[PDB]
Amino acid sequence: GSSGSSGDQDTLVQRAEHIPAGKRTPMCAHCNQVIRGPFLVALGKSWHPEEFNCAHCKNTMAYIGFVEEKGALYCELCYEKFFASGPSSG
Ligand SMILES: [Zn+2]
Ligand SMILES: [Zn+2]
């Protein structure tokens, strides 16, 4: 065996594990309905790859990342936009 318990610093932006069909048929979080096909497991729960969308830009948050805040998922874009308030030309 070996030892670890060590890691590097990274951004909060988390991701969802794309689960294939057949593997498992958990219960969605939004609609709360048994999933037959592939689902996304994140935040300690499952969701539909068709509904799973941002809270502001309501965009597909399957590939891109997302950040939770007081019960709200914000894609890296939204976050970096609000959170990481960089310099504004105007
Ligand atoms: Zn659903
Ligand atoms: Zn967004």
UniProtKB/Swiss-Prot annotation:
Heart and skeletal muscle specific. Expression is commonly increased in the brain of patients with bipolar disorder, schizophrenia, and major depression. It comes from the Eukaryota. Residues 26-84 form the LIM zinc-binding domain. It is found in: Postsynaptic density; Presynapse; Postsynapse; Cytoplasm, Cytosol. May play an important role in the heart development by scaffolding PKC to the Z-disk region. May play a role in the regulation of cardiomyocyte expansion. Isoforms lacking the LIM domains may negatively modulate the scaffolding activity of isoform 1. Overexpression promotes the development of heart hypertrophy. Contributes to the regulation of dendritic spine morphogenesis in neurons. May be required to restrain postsynaptic growth of excitatory synapses. Isoform 1, but not isoform 2, expression favors spine thinning and elongation. Interacts with various PKC isoforms through the LIM domains. Interacts with actin and alpha-actinin through the PDZ domain. Interacts (via LIM domains) with SIPA1L1/SPAR; this interaction may occur preferentially with isoform 1. This is PDZ and LIM domain protein 5. The gene is PDLIM5.
